């Protein structure tokens, strides 16, 4: 039972105060803009950061900052349950019930089915606009245990083509792949919005 902590959505001063409290607890803290396989993500708010989407895809704990404040005061890591994003749903919210519950939904669903991530058995080709990095999308996909097919790997068994501007590509270009095309937004929607 490890506590590998990352934080998302906090400004520098808030982050400094929370990391100071981690010195009262046995744990690991990873400073990176990237998702680095944290067991517990502390999120300022529901969002679509790399850390938040990747933690959802891997069924990790995504919790409020009160989890750190109360655990440090108690001198011991507490039960995560009441601190989870998804423990209680706001009926009046800019965020859908599905999005508000997404961290809990995936954590419980992956435990129920035994799957190691939300994208397990996916074999994905990314056609991301050449002017930008696909790196964050790749780390989210891999956190969900998708197999991201590199250009030098065989296209056998591709399940998804996730493409910049998937909705305007000609059928002739789509015909270069057996698998269907999905827009970039599908990744976020599958995790946060879709009713499975």
């Amino acid at each position: 039972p490890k506590h590998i902590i990352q934080m998302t959505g906090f400004k520098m001063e808030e982050k400094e105060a929370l990391v100071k409290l981690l010195l009262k607890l046995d744990c690991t803290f990873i400073k990176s803009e990237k998702y680095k396989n944290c067991t517990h993500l502390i999120a300022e708010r529901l969002c679509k950061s790399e850390k938040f989407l990747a933690a959802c895809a891997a069924g990790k704990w995504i919790l409020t900052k009160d989890y750190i404040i109360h655990s440090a005061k108690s001198g011991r890591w507490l039960d995560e349950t009441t601190y989870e994003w998804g423990y209680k749903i706001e009926k009046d919210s800019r965020y859908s019930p599905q999005m508000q519950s997404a961290p809990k939904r995936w954590r419980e669903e992956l435990k129920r089915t035994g799957a190691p991530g939300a994208f397990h058995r996916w074999k994905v080709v990314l056609l991301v606009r050449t002017d930008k990095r696909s790196d964050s999308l790749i780390r989210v996909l891999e956190a969900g245990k998708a197999n991201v097919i590199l250009p030098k790997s065989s296209p056998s068994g591709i399940t998804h083509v996730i493409a910049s501007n998937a909705r305007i590509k000609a059928e002739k270009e789509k015909d270069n792949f057996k698998a269907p095309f999905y827009p970039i937004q599908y990744l976020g929607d599958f995790l946060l919005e879709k009713l499975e």
């Binding site: 679509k48 950061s49 850390k51 989407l53 989210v140 976020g188």
Partner: peptide, 16 residues
Amino acid sequence: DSCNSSSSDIIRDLLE
């Protein structure tokens, strides 16, 4: 802060 500049919406970033 440059030391704390992670994106809060990596989907939105790819559409702009």
